[PDB]
A paper describes a structure:
To validate the hypothesis, we constructed recombinant RBD subunits of XBB.1.5, XBB.1.5+L455F, XBB.1.5+F456L, and XBB.1.5+L455F+F456L (“FLip”), and determined their binding affinities to hACE2 by surface plasmon resonance (SPR) assays. The dissociation equilibrium constants (KD) demonstrate 6.4 nM, 25 nM, 11 nM, and 2.0 nM for the four mutants, respectively. As we expected, all three spike trimers mainly showed two ‘RBD-open’ and one ‘RBD-closed’ conformations with one or two ACE2 bound. To further reveal the impacts of mutations of residues 455 and 456 on the interface, we determined the high-resolution structures of these three variants’ RBD in complex with ACE2 at resolution of 3.3 Å, 3.0 Å, and 3.0 Å, respectively. With an unambiguous electron density observed, reliable analyses of the interaction interface can be performed. In contrast, the distances between Q493 and H34 in XBB.1.5 and XBB.1.5+F456L are only 4.78 Å and 4.86 Å, respectively, indicating very weak interactions.
Since late 2022, XBB* variants, especially XBB.1.5 and other XBB derivatives with a proline on residue 486 (486P) on the receptor-binding domain (RBD) of the virus Spike glycoprotein (S) started to dominate, which demonstrated enhanced binding to human ACE2 while maintaining extremely strong capability of evading humoral immunity. Interestingly, L455 and F456 are two adjacent residues on the receptor-binding motif (RBM) of SARS-CoV-2 RBD, and the variant is just the “flipping” of the two residues, L455-F456 to F455-L456, also known as the “FLip” mutant. These two sites are also located on a critical epitope that targeted by the public IGHV3-53/3-66 Class 1 NAbs. L455F caused strong affinity reduction on XBB.1.5, but significantly improved the hACE2-binding affinity of XBB.1.5+F456L. Both L455 and F456 are on the core of the RBD-hACE2 interface, forming a compact conformation with D30 and K31 on ACE2.
Residue numbers in the entry:
A (entry chain B): 334 to 529
B (entry chain A): 19 to 612
Write the structure that this text describes.
């Protein structure tokens, strides 16, 4: 059925790290070798699955999470990692069985005036849980005094923009991460690998 | 939420947004410096105004949290660098007056040139002309005319401006909960909060004075040597009892003695090691210098340089079009962009400056993981010390033979070692009495022990006590000779250079003994030595996070300034001066009377 793996990868517009995307791709012939079309892959971490034995097992669902981060924050997309992306924006579980494919996109998601369309969440009242999303714009409150809504002293907005530019370092350039997560629920699997 | 816990989120948001605004301001300042254009001037001015307004607003927000309740030390240091009122503690009229005083002082120093000789058609500018006629001259009268014409033309304008500048600076320092403006400038070498590693400003004066008293014999022997050699080319204008005129000291202030080498040659039959012909013979252009320099830096153990630094930086001349300022600087623009503006020439001095101005960029790539307000040297003397120890290790004949710019058949000798040691000493230990005297005079002027009606009386008296040079002309009170120095008229701290030398020789002596080197200290190299590279990176990674009394201890073993690595570095020379200075009187005194 030619499972796409192309709307996730060859997308004109990606998503910010706080409002990341998730595509439940199912009922298809997996075609994992289509992914290898892109050459400049900066990371191919493959926890839980052999990187050559993908197209022989069958899973109920696969999830292709898609966001854009810095280059120095791509090490936080891994099981058990902590920081400022693995606990406020995108937390992935300790029982991860997937792929952390993440290439460089400085030539597509960075402008010389600033890509302030790509956001990032700096403040939360609690850490994040595995595969949980928080699209909220409510003000933070560091002080013990009520902010009475929108305010400025000791009442900060949580989201801080990334502001990508072409003249950044490798660790500060935009990185389009496509995380693959295979799910193995005890259900009739709809995704299977090609075999003669 | 405690005050310590609510300060951390404020600091985090400040660090992120200030990193963005600092990148915008620094990129605007680059493209202004590499391209002189009115549009770039307006862009830099707008970015700087936005950054200054942001800094004022965040300082006003940061005054809320007192420092007494905070127990963490990095947050304490960040808020201490963030809670400073600065010049805003004054009234609006007084702040505007101080800003205008600074601006007209800077423009008077920058644009002012002497029109004294003959008709006012002949007016030599300070930057191309006056430095040239001060560096290379053999005339007592011409140097006397140039010296008298500048100080008097500039100082007569400076002095009534300078009294008001001193009064306003002392007022804004007193309102800033400090004691004086000198006490404000000594607030950078201040540690308060750590047990066993603590520093006070009175301790900073005392330690500087003690280190100068320790270093005095070396400078005194060098003084006797340069007086003895300057007697030969200058007859009947210098007395054998002591002292030499201050208008003869290479530069126009006495700051550096580097241009006296042609008249203070240790051995004229043996030329100094120059590689410019050999550097240009092998067609090394402008990229091979900064490729072999990064080869040396990776040989030490320090990491590579990113691809976003070769394309962005400007390492070659800009050409006839695209006017730019050819002053080498190590631009840390912020978020991962490390660029090193520099107009590379085919010269050894350019090679060692490329090693020097990339030491500052390897410090910048090492403390980049630190929070935004801690992204600096632990004091102001760490950066230039790091850069100049890279330059000192790059200047060894062994490293030049290793990288290919020296024939193996060329051999070293004690004569060449003596020549190199005196050449380095004329730059290094020449500037330490000048720095100490100038900063002591400025400290006592700002503190109030020096009366206003007796100010320049002090310089030429203090100068007859510390440096030891005669006044070329009797100068009366109506002047501000101290000023006429880029670092005084533009309100800069000057003790950074003293601290830099006293730390650079400690760093070299402490690193080249971890590299397993046997022999003289002036031939040490960090190349092919990861054991010293990791030791240096142990300090480079800290930044301003840990106090300087500990970061100095993490590489040397001492928690204070020490001139013993300086006197042992410059030991092979010292002895030679002790042997040669036996048929001439040594020291100086105020027995001179005109
Ligand atoms: C990816 O999208 C671009 C959009 O211009 C297109 O040119 C290219 O052919 C696409 N690649 C594949 C493999 O379809
Ligand atoms: C430098 O400034 C000139 C001035 O017109 C303009 O061409 C442009 O802004 C810059 N050009 C280059 C080549 O950097
Ligand atoms: C201050 O807080 C930081 C939190 O990032 C912590 O790492 C550091 O250890 C604290 N300081 C001390 C002295 O414990
Ligand atoms: C990175 O350093 C290594 C030395 O370990 C060497 O390949 C070179 O200096 C650098 N790499 C590139 C591609 O320049
Ligand atoms: C450092 O090691 C390199 C690699 O063998 C060598 O070519 C070079 O001469 C060495 N330099 C020194 C100063 O030992």
């Amino acid at each position: 059925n030619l499972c796409p793996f192309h709307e996730v990868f060859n997308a004109t517009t990606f998503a910010s790290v706080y409002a990341w995307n998730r595509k439940r791709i199912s009922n298809c012939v997996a075609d994992y070798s289509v992914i290898y079309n892109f050459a400049p892959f900066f990371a191919f971490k493959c926890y839980g699955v052999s990187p050559t034995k993908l197209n022989d097992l069958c899973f109920t669902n696969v999830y292709a999470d898609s966001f854009v981060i810095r280059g120095n924050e791509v090490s936080q997309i891994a099981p058990g990692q902590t920081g400022n992306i693995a606990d406020y924006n995108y937390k992935l579980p300790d029982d991860f069985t997937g792929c952390v494919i993440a290439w460089n996109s400085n030539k597509l998601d960075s402008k010389p005036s600033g890509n302030y369309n790509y956001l990032y969440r700096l403040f939360r009242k609690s850490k994040l849980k595995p595969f949980e999303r928080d699209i909220s714009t409510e003000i933070y409150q560091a002080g013990n005094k009520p902010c009475n809504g929108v305010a400025g002293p000791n009442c900060y907005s949580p989201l801080q923009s990334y502001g990508f530019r072409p003249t950044y370092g490798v660790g500060h350039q935009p990185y389009r991460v496509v995380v693959l997560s295979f799910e193995l629920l005890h259900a009739p699997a709809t995704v299977c690998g090609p075999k003669k | 939420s405690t005050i310590e816990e609510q300060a951390k989120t404020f600091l985090d948001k400040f660090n992120h947004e200030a990193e963005d605004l600092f990148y915008q301001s620094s990129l605007a300042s680059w493209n202004y410096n590499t391209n002189i254009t009115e549009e770039n001037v307006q862009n830099m001015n707008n970015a700087g105004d936005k950054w200054s307004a942001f800094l004022k607003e965040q300082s006003t927000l940061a005054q809320m949290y007192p420092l007494q309740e905070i127990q963490n030390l990095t947050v304490k240091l960040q808020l201490q660098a963030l809670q400073q009122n600065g010049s805003s503690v004054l009234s609006e009229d007084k702040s505007k007056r101080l800003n205008t005083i600074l601006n007209t002082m800077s423009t008077i120093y920058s644009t002012g040139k002497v029109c004294n000789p003959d008709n006012p058609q002949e007016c030599l500018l300070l930057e191309p002309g006056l430095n040239e006629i001060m560096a290379n001259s053999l005339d007592y009268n011409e140097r006397l005319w140039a010296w008298e014409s500048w100080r008097s033309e500039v100082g007569k304008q400076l002095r009534p401006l300078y009294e008001e500048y001193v009064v306003l600076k002392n007022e804004m320092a007193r309102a800033n909960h400090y004691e004086d403006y000198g006490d404000y400038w000594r607030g950078d070498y201040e540690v308060n909060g750590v047990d066993g590693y603590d520093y006070s400003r009175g301790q900073l004066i005392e330690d500087v004075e003690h280190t100068f008293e320790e270093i005095k014999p070396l400078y005194e022997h060098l003084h006797a040597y340069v007086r003895a050699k300057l007697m030969n080319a200058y007859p009947s204008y210098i007395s054998p009892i002591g002292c030499l005129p201050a208008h003869l000291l290479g530069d126009m202030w006495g700051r550096f003695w580097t241009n006296l080498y042609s008249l203070t040659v240790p051995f004229g039959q043996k030329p100094n090691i120059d590689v410019t012909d050999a550097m240009v013979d092998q067609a090394w252009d402008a990229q091979r210098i900064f490729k072999e320099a990064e080869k040396f830096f990776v040989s030490v153990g320090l990491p590579n340089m990113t691809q976003g630094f070769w394309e962005n930086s400007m390492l070659t001349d800009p050409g006839n079009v695209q006017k730019a300022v050819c002053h080498p600087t190590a631009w840390d623009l912020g978020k991962g962009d490390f660029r090193i503006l520099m107009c590379t020439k085919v010269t050894m001095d350019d090679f060692l400056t490329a090693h020097h101005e990339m030491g500052h960029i390897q410090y910048d790539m090492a403390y980049a993981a630190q929070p935004f307000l801690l992204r600096n040297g632990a004091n102001e003397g760490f950066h230039e010390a790091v850069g100049e120890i890279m330059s000192l290790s790059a200047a060894t004949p062994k490293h030049l033979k290793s990288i290919g710019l020296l024939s193996p058949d060329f051999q070293e000798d004690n004569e060449t070692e003596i020549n190199f040691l005196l050449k380095q000493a004329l730059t290094i230990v020449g500037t330490l009495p000048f720095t100490y005297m100038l900063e002591k005079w400025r400290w006592m002027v700002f503190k109030g022990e020096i009366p206003k009606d007796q100010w320049m009386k002090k310089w030429w008296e203090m100068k007859r006590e510390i440096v030891g040079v005669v006044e070329p002309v009797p100068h009366d009170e109506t002047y501000c000779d101290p000023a006429s120095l880029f670092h005084v008229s533009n309100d800069y701290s000057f003790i950074r250079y003293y601290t830099r030398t006293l730390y650079q020789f400690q760093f070299q002596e402490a690193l080249c003994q971890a590299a397993k080197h046997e022999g003289p200290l002036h031939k040490c190299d960090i190349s092919n030595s990861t054991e010293a590279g990791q030791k240096l990176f142990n300090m480079l990674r800290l930044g301003k996070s840990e106090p300087w009394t500990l970061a100095l201890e993490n590489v040397v073993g001492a928690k204070n300034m020490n001139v013993r690595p300086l006197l042992n570095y410059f030991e092979p020379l010292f002895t030679w001066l002790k042997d040669q200075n036996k048929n001439s009187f040594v020291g100086w005194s105020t027995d001179w009377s005109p």
